[PDB]
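Hi D.,

Good news: the full-assembly prediction came through. Inputs first.
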Amino acid sequence: LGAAVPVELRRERRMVCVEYPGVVRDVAKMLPTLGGEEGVSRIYADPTKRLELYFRPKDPYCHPVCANRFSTSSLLLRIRKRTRRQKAHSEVTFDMEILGIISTIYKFQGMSDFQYLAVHTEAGGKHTSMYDKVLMLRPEKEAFFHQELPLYIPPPIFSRLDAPVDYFYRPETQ
Amino acid sequence: EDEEEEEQLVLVELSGIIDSDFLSKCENKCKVLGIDTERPILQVDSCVFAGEYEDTLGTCVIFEENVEHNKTVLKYKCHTMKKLSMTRTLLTEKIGGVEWLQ
Amino acid sequence: RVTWSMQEDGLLVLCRIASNVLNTKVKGPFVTWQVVRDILHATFEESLDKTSHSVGRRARYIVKNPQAYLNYKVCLAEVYQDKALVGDFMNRRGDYDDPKVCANEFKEFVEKLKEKFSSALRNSNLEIPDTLQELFARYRVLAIGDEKDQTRKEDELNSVDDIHFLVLQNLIQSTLALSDSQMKSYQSFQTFRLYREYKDHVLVKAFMECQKRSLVNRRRVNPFVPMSYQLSQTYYRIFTWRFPSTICTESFQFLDRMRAAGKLDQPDRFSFKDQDNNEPTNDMVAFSLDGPGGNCVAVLTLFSLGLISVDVRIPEQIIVVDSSMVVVNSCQMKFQLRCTPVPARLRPAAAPLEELTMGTSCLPDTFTKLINPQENTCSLEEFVLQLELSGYSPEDLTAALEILEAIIATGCFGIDKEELRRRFSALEKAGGGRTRTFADCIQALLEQHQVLEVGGNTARLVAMGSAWPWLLHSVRLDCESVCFIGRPWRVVDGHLNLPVCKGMMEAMLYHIMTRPGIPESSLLRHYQGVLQPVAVLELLQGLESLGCIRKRWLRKPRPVSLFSTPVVEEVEVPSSLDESPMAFYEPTLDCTLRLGRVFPHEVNWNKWIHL
Amino acid sequence: DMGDLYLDVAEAFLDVGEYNSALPLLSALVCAVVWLRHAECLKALGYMERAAESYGKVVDLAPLHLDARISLSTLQQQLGQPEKALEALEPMYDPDTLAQDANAAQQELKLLLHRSTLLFSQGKMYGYVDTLLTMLAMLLKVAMNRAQVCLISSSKSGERHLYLIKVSRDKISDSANCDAKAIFAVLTSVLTKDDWWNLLLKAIYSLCDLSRFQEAELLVDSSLEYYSFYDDRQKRKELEYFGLSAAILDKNFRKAYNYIRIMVMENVNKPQLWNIFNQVTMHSQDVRHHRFCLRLMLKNPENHALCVLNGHNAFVSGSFKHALGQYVQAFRTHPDEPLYSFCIGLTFIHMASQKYVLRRHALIVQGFSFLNRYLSLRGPCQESFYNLGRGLHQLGLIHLAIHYYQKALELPPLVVEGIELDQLDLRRDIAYNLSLIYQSSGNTGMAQTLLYTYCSI
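Then the structure:
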């Protein structure tokens, strides 16, 4: 067994963790759901706000998951398994470094809200996309405001509450 | 003869320590041992921490503080699937293995 | 406005620890959060940002993070580890409770606590050795593990004393629930005849376990004996999940009331009290508003299966003052079972709800079986002939005999199931001139009752000819001999199960209802004190045969150390040559209806729960 | 001098339909109008490149001649692109000297118009916008400054280009010798006001297609500040629609609200207003609509759109009691609507959520029966079974939520076009809410399975 390795503990700048509920294939796709570096930095600027994860960020009507911010004492430790083969035998050596101090962690604990897709159902049960209509995605007033179209009016958030209630088919006299 | 790099970005998180400023101050001694075993050990300002590797359930995404000339901002820097969960140890010169009291 | 921060958070956590310790002195030892807030201001004048109300919530926000919550628990343990910092606080019998002393002692204790937990390190001077071997050779190294740190369950120790113990642990509970009527109906001497089969040592051991965990309260009346103790309030606290026991049987009572209207294809309708001139000839069951809570879950599940239709009759005025800018008139509704399920609802992957038998006979033999080792021919030849008249190749005959030989060799002990499956994993595949799988061969030996699944702390198989110490021997009422597996819900006479005890099985569903997806190694360990852990699996075996419960498995995750990546997958337990041991459980869609139909709505065992 | 006689002889060539003899004739003079006669003869002849070269000498000799200035660049554009054709579209007129160069601003505006077409045809979109913005600044700065908007230039785009900005009143805050009306008179001699409107359109479009929606909004607000179009309410409405569209598409939802509030209050029942107004007030943090929705509902008590929408506000305020009556009265008008059958069946579950317990079952079954009518109206869907799952999760009834989520995973996404499949797909949210159930139940492995397979993104 090798000896302990001295580690360059930078303490250079603090680091902030987002415990993103997912496996990040590519960071270019994960970051837009947190609202990007602009988003998480603004939410780091006011601890009374909560970090909101929009699992379907291309859809304006995606109601988000909300984070709870917490303090923590944590470090990011890059191990470098400097591997070798030498006369011949394979060999392993370690370098390692601690890149910063992680003071803060965001944990996603509030359940995802109710979500309602941008599709109207006529009483005949056929589904009609308003994504072709309401997204305003072409800037030249693509949703021409006077047009006869379904009303599609989801409440701003379908619930204030992201935690389960203590109800269990339980009455009380109170 | 031959040399090669293999790496992983183990997030280390510490516990059994409160109202601390250790990480801001401890650099005077900063050492790691047994890092590839099942129970690696961290020595930090001659405090000693022990733990096990754990998968992050989500991906832990790590951002660096940055500054605009001042205002704090973040940049993405790392992501990691793997994490190290640590507890402050107690020592007494007397054996094998860290004793964990349930 | 308020902005909390890591510094005050850390001190508040220490004040939380101090609050927890001083709660052992006086319940609510703080006069008000002012006593903390004063310490906050005294330590951090910027605490002028913070109200005493904010302290009362922040002490409950921080604990939401498991890591910070664990950080509290570990530091609290490191306080509790040393009496010297608490003794002068705890040992005082004078000055026990007044606001001034409670305030002063709280501040003094926190001021002393800040000497143990501090921003700079207690000892930065220590010599520490070069590597793990040197570390342990020099130092005893210790840390607080989590209270959940454990290994998987394993086979119990080798003694007949352990066999006696692991039956006796629940024979006692089979008495504790009995009413005096049972204690008369199976008389005191008749149960003494039973208990006198077991040594006082394991009896004291079993009662001490029950007494130590506060599961037992003294009975008041006018070795252990039935008059001595009963299920404590805390024993019910084990099983008294917040779901009140009555719900599920009240929810079947709703369904069975609903059958009084028959069945009809009528769609639901929502209608005005303004249109009393329009009525479905009133042929719908009116819902009892504020009826027992089973009336609530029954409608919820029947909607989900698509199996009920409702007339929700609501007036034009739910709100008495509706015209105002800024009283609930809760409103009647009437129900009827559907003839056929609505299209594409959550078809339950189960038998139709009408097809069920609506009676206690639905419970599997597991709860009512009597074992009788003398019921069949002793010679293997009869069972060889039974397999020879089955489809078995001689390769299967010798394979079956090869499996049987290991189990009969252990005598009063049994081979544990997983040990057997490894040893004969070569017999799994049914290749090489086999016709039967291992599972069929052992199942035949079990079904032809050469073997019995006598259990223990884990599933063990034993030869039927030697299973005796795993079984209670009793008599039906002048009397007739009967033998059965000992369980807390079975009658001491062995002849019957106790339906009033099956509130245990109602609670077991409420457990998996409260914690759906609970992994087996946590559910089974939860009952560590109360239930002999195999008995937890037999209740789960029960509720699955009732259709209330669904088992699922994962393949065991490989360790995450050393650059590994998790093998994370569901599996359908196909094999022994590679494992699938992590079973976990879920409720099914209609578990309250599927259970309630089995049990008459007699008075619950739970009456002791009053404080 | 002979140049006059030779120019008359040069015209005598055109009097016989000839141009080419101007080349010898000029070659006898030179060793200007004669170079222009020669250059334009060369343009009537095939020698377009020699005409441009001759126009080069014209512009070198007479750079003030606007027609030569245009002719050189347009011929160079005709000879090829990009071929340094925007050169010789330099105005070289100075903003301090406009005490006389306001006359030259006629050329400057004309040159910028031509230059804009070269930039647009080349595709130098930022430079094209620069010409448009400079022209519009010359037209409208007297309102941009009143909008506290100013023009700047910076390399932030990778090259020194122009941008609009707001300016702080501590620095700059919201007609002498008739200068403004003289500037108006001379510049309207180039472009009529409908072409100033066309410039407004072209600038807004180009800003939008450059994705510089923020600057388009600044221009729109400045143009709404321009009374002499704001007084034409058709233009105003169209500017409002652009201003709304930009302020939506840049996500300045606070600024968007200020517009959409006006349009809705004038047209209380057009559905494709309410569809937008809702999402603007959904993304904006501003609470201001709550009092506004009371005023309009008292104004129009019959109005179904407000009847439900005022319910949303009270429901968002947590007053589930008074909120519900506004959904139900809406549902009385349009019963076969999933959303209203949803919002009512969801409101009784909010009420049943609260700390009080009184008859709580009756609130829950009134809750869940209305959710069954939502499900029945909506049909089997990822959306339908998820939302009943989350409704039963909110009440902690996770013995039923678990099956509603599993059903929504086993069922494929809502196919309809307009947004990509993985964005209509709810597999992520329902795998997460199961992962919360499984994590809370102490099952990390099953939670991990869900995030690996369904939440890989």
